[PDB]
Amino acid sequence: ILPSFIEHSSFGVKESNPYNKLFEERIIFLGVQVDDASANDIMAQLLVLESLDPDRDITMYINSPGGGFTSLMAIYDTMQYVRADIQTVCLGQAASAAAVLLAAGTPGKRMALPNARVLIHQPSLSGVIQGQFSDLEIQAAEIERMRTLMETTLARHTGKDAGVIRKDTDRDKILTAEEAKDYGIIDTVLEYRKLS
Amino acid sequence: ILPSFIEHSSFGVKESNPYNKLFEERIIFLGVQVDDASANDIMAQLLVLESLDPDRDITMYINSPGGGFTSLMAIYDTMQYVRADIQTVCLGQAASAAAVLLAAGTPGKRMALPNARVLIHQPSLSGVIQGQFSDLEIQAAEIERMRTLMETTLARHTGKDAGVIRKDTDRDKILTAEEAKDYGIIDTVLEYRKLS
């Protein structure tokens, strides 16, 4: 259950949803696994914030298990396309595909919370795809391209060589906030702003 | 079925939901298991109450079985980040993850109802995860990190040493309201305000 709150000014009264208030502040929230549904929604949101104020930064809050490859590159291209700089913030985790999106933020604007974590691993296929060797030969060829492409993408954003990425991602690599900063996935780690 | 009530002032009439009235009073209600959905909703709510009045305390009512680790630390960081002090109140139980959130409130403002209970135990995996020993070696490594991290966070909020927590959390430890006060999870126990 998500409560709605109320705001008022001399011009009128506004009843709004917390997530709507975030979007009013130019904050896109990726809270779910990346898929065609989630991807299309995020691309739509990105292009809207582009339309409204192309000169103002866009913010992406990321808590995600990760997700599909096409969905990832759809979001990735849209992030890079938009004229506005994109700030990425990680809450509680960014894994697999989501870890790439986290790193895909514009330099210096990538950050995470202290107890957030980051997972990186090579692309995987949970099920089994069957067919003639000719067909599998084609699928396998594409899969290697997608593997190398994730390595290249992570490489230029993190600053590491593609070869290093390939080696580290062979097995799941979990990174704390600080470990992710050293790896080059995020630029800074947010510190608690509390007064007390 | 949850009834909605009606309020009226010289400025107009307002039809509102009970949970909305709570949020108007800066009360976030965690009534469910902690997951990505619940976490994102709570984080959104915290940042809103942050935005509206950063100087005023935020209240968190907790009745929960507990939940995921990443989801917990997502909520935890947001609680600690926000400039406003955070009051935590436990209704009927706070277990596992929820027990940490209850203790993660700002000092002196953590409280519980008399017949509420508090459960503390080490992280557990109900299902089975399979793979090569290299993968399991990594998962097990992460799992120990998450255990120790829960122990450290509980330690600094309760005041107990991490070693003590680790011993107590080895097996499930159920605490009454008063037992939770002595342990350092809550500062006080609410007393009935009834006149009769």
Binding site: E25, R26, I27, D57, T59, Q87, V89, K109, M111, L113, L190 | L47, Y81
Partner: peptide
């Protein structure tokens, strides 16, 4: 999370 995001 402002500063600086936003």
């Amino acid at each position: 999370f402002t500063p600086x995001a936003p």
